[PDB]
Structure formats: C-alpha cells, structure tokens
Amino acid sequence: KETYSSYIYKVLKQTHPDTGISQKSMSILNSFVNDIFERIATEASKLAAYNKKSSAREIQTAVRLIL
Amino acid sequence: LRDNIQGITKPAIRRLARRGGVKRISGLIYEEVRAVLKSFLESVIRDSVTYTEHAKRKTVTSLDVVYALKRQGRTLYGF
Amino acid sequence: KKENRLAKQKFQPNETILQFLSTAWLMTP
Amino acid sequence: PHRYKPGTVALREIRRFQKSTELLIRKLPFQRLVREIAQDFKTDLRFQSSAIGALQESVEAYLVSLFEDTNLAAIHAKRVTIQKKEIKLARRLRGER
DNA sequence: GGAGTAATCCCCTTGGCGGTTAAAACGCGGGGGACAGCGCGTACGTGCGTTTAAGCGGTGCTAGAGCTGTCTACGACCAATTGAGCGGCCTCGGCACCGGGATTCTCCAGGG
DNA sequence: CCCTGGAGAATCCCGGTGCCGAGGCCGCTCAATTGGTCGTAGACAGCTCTAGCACCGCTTAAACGCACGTACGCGCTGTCCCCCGCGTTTTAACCGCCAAGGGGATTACTCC
Numbered sequence: 169k170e171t172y173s174s175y176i177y178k179v180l181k182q183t184h185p186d187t188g189i190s191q192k193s194m195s196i197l198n199s200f201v202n203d204i205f206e207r208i209a210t211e212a213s214k215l216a217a218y219n220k221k222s223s224a225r226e227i228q229t230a231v232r233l234i235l
Numbered sequence: 236l237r238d239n240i241q242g243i244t245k246p247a248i249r250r251l252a253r254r255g256g257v258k259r260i261s262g263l264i265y266e267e268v269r270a271v272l273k274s275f276l277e278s279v280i281r282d283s284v285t286y287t288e289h290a291k292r293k294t295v296t297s298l299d300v301v302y303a304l305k306r307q308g309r310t311l312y313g314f
Numbered sequence: 315k316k317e318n319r320l321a322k323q324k325f326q327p328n329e330t331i332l333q334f335l336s337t338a339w340l341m342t343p
Numbered sequence: 344p345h346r347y348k349p350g351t352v353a354l355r356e357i358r359r360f361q362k363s364t365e366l367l368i369r370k371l372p373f374q375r376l377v378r379e380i381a382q383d384f385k386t387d388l389r390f391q392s393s394a395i396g397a398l399q400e401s402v403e404a405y406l407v408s409l410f411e412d413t414n415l416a417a418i419h420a421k422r423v424t425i426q427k428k429e430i431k432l433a434r435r436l437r438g439e440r
Numbered sequence: 441g442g443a444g445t446a447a448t449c450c451c452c453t454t455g456g457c458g459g460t461t462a463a464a465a466c467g468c469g470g471g472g473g474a475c476a477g478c479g480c481g482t483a484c485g486t487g488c489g490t491t492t493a494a495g496c497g498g499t500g501c502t503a504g505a506g507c508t509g510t511c512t513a514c515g516a517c518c519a520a521t522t523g524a525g526c527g528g529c530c531t532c533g534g535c536a537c538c539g540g541g542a543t544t545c546t547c548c549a550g551g552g
Numbered sequence: 553c554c555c556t557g558g559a560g561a562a563t564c565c566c567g568g569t570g571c572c573g574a575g576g577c578c579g580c581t582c583a584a585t586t587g588g589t590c591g592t593a594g595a596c597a598g599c600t601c602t603a604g605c606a607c608c609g610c611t612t613a614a615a616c617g618c619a620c621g622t623a624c625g626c627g628c629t630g631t632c633c634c635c636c637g638c639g640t641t642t643t644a645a646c647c648g649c650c651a652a653g654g655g656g657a658t659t660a661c662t663c664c
C-alpha cells in the first residue's frame with residue numbers, strides 16, 4: 169500500500185533523472201532503513217533517563233555514537 | 236515422514252572451500268566444517284527451543300531469522 | 315550412455331575333481 | 344590427456360567459482376538438514392516461502408567465514424589447506440559457548 | 441421473523457506418484473600439499489650490583505556537586521475541512537549470458 | 553639441465569529483440585490543520601562541601617646492566633599422502649497429478 173518509492177524517486181530526480189534500479193534493492197532498502205530506524209529509536213530511549221532531563225539531542229547522540 | 240543427510244558432497248563442499256580460498260585439500264576439510272555447522276545450529280536452536288518452551292508460544296513472521304542469527308553471531312540481509 | 319540410462323538369487327551346487335557321476339541306468343535301447 | 348599441475352587448474356576452479364552469483368552449495372540436502380533440525384524438537388512450523396533461502400544464506404555466511412578464518416590459520420601454520428585444528432582455532436576464539 | 445436443523449460450497453488438506461537434476465561420491469595420477477627433526481645459532485634466559493618514582497601522609501580551602509523555594513518554558517486532548525500520495529496500471533528506455541572472434545592460463549617434450 | 557613450439561582449454565566487447573520495470577497519473581480520503589482547553593519537565597537562586605592538592609617529606613618497588621650462556625625458527629630434508637581435476641554416476645528436493653471427507657461458513661427450509 170504505502171510506498172516510500174515515490175519519494176525515493178523524487179530524491180533520485182534531485183540526483184539523477186533517468187536511472188532505473190531493481191526491486192531487490194528496494195526490499196533491502198526497506199529492511200536496512202527500518203532496522204536503522206529501530207536501532208536509532210532504541211539508542212535514544214533512556215538517555216533522557218541518564219540524568220533528570222527528560223528531544224532532538226537524544227537522536228543527535230544516537231547518530232553521533234552509531235556512526 | 237522425515238529425511239536425513241548423506242554426507243555433504245565432495246563437489247559442493249569443494250566449492251565451499253573454493254570460495255573459502257582453497258585449491259588443494261587435506262583430509263580435514265569436507266566433514267568437519269559441517270560439524271561446526273551442526274554444533275552452531277544446534278546451539279542456536281537450543282536457545283530458540285528454550286525461548287519457545289519457557290513461555291510455550293509459537294513464533295512470528297520471517298523477521299525472526301535476522302534477529303536470532305544476529306544474536307547467534309552471523310546474521311543476513313537480502314530483503 | 316546405455317550404462318548410465320539403465321541405472322532374487324538362486325541356488326546351484328558344483329562338483330569337480332574326484333567324482334562318481336552316479337547313474338543306475340537300465341541301459342536298454 | 345591434457346593433465347596439468349593440480350592447484351593451477353584448482354586455481355581456475357577458484358576463479359570460476361569466485362566470480363558470479365552462482366550458488367556454489369549444491370544444497371537442497373542442506374535444506375533437508377534444516378528440516379531435520381527444525382522438526383527435531385517441535386512441529387507445525389507454518390513459515391514463509393523464501394525463508395529457506397535466507398536461512399541457508401546465513402548458513403553459507405557462517406560456514407564460509409569459518410572457511411576463510413580456517414585458511415588464514417592454516418597459512419599461519421605450515422599447511423595451506425583446511426585443517427580441523429585450524430577450524431578449532433577459528434571457532435574456540437569466537438566464543439563457541 | 442430471526443434463529444434451529446441441516447442441506448450446500450468448497451477447498452484444503454492426509455497421503456501417494458509422474459518428471460526431474462543435481463548430490464554426493466568414485467576414480468585414477470601425481471605432484472603439490474602434510475607435518476615434522478634437525479642446524480645452529482640467534483633468540484631469548486636470567487639473577488644480583490646500581491638508582492627515580494609511587495603511592496602516598498603531616499595544614500586550608502579548594503574545582504566540581506548535591507543541594508530546596510516556586511515556579512518559566514512547553515507538548516498532547518477534542519471538532520468541521522481538506523490535500524498527499526496512495527488505490528490500481530502498466531508505459532517507452534533500455535535490458536540480458538553465451539555467440540561473431542580466440543588470446544589468453546597452464547604444462548610439456550625437444551631446440552638449445 | 554634453461555627456453556620454448558606446440559598441445560590442451562574458455563569466456564570478454566555488445567546483442568536475442570521482445571518485454572522488466574518504477575512509481576508517474578485518474579483523483580479521493582483520512583489523519584494533519586486551526587477553533588477554542590490544559591498543568592507538567594527544566595530550572596534560577598541558593599551554601600557550604602568530599603578528600604586531599606599546593607608545600608614538606610618520604611622507602612623501597614620497580615626499573616636498569618653483565619656475563620655469559622644455553623636452547624629452538626624456519627626451512628632442508630625427508631618420506632608420505634593424498635585427495636582434487638573434472639568426467640561420470642547414482643542418492644536426491646520440489647512441484648503438478650490423482651480421488652476423497654471435514655468442516656467452517658451459509659443460507660434452504662422452517663418454527664415456536
């Protein structure tokens with residue numbers, strides 16, 4: 169139903185106008201993008217519970233440490 | 236209605252070694268790697284059956300293989 | 315290619331060396 | 344009888360087998376081993392369709408990584424080919440248990 | 441006049457075979473892989489005559505630390521409207537491994 | 553013996569030329585707006601304070617040579633082993649083909 173594919177091809181048109189890709193790459197995109205989402209959500213969950221300050225800096229720290 | 240293994244090839248195990256960077260062979264190349272396969276798989280299924288017997292519940296969709304093998308020590312992508 | 319495409323036991327005694335091939339024949343022809 | 348030195352024709356075997364997406368595992372009996380593993384303790388799996396390919400490719404990853412680690416430990420010793428002791432070195436250090 | 445009995449749909453399994461190729465193995469030749477003992481020396485072996493530092497303990501507060509009033513700075517309900525890309529399809533550009541053509545990869549027995 | 557004339561094999565530059573192929577395009581629809589409501593995380597002022605660092609003042613604990621000195625690192629060298637090379641053959645999963653009952657659902661027929 170819902171497809172990120174149209175937005176992905178919009179970004180492609182921002183980069184390359186007339187290039188074609190495969191469906192297996194799309195499925196791997198789905199898997200890896202979603203597991204990145206899960207990991208980034210997991211990393212920045214209880215950081216606000218490390219000290220009594222419970223935002224943007226949580227996910228910023230997540231991307232700072234995973235990368 | 237059950238089937239069991241017969242020895243895991245001279246040829247296909249040889250290609251397994253071929254992509255493992257092996258040209259000739261010793262007497263300890265074909266059989267033992269399959270033994271490591273069996274030991275690792277028996278350990279991971281031991282953990283899985285412990286998980287599914289402690290609470291006595293079934294499993295979920297094909298997303299289990301990537302998570303279970305990642306905890307095991309070698310997971311996969313592809314879809 | 316025939317050998318590749320293609321792919322009860324009996325009882326039989328033997329006799330040799332010292333032998334009396336015996337026959338009680340009324341040799342009357 | 345064009346019989347050449349083994350190892351160089353084994354080298355061309357390596358070149359052929361290490362070039363494309365060819366499935367080097369002639370391995371539906373690998374699937375039967377997986378079935379024996381799965382139905383060893385439980386039953387009524389009712390799994391997906393292509394999950395056999397994913398689990399088998401994970402098996403390939405584990406076994407082949409073991410193969411390269413074993414060959415590295417073998418050239419570490421004075422024996423180029425795969426030896427069981429090299430595999431013990433490759434698996435025990437991984438934390439097998 | 442909606443449910444009780446039961447006649448209907450039906451499709452899905454419980455299971456056994458056509459058709460089937462790969463799956464493991466044989467199998468012979470040999471020659472490269474199998475694994476180590478020695479050469480000897482270099483590769484370490486080592487234990488007491490000869491010192492800086494390490495882990496400190498003699499004042500006074502001394503960079504960061506936990507600290508209780510009373511809040512400044514914000515992030516999530518509902519209700520009528522509406523636009524993003526989704527609900528479904530398949531359009532025009534460019535596909536997709538062995539052939540036209542064969543020099544590469546590898547060894548071997550005579551030129552030399 | 554080196555060097556090599558000659559022998560074996562095998563898939564890289566671009567298609568087979570008919571279709572894969574990704575998410576534009578028809579617009580609509582369902583959780584986003586803004587119409588008002590609402591009390592909670594983050595925090596500013598606040599006060600000395602934990603254990604001991606600046607001096608002094610340390611006692612030996614590692615840290616450093618010597619005088620030889622005494623064995624094993626890597627490959628020669630050894631059999632030895634030994635298992636692929638790749639053709640060839642036989643164990644060996646998957647997916648339709650069969651003809652039936654169970655039975656969940658579902659209403660024909662009906663009934664209290």
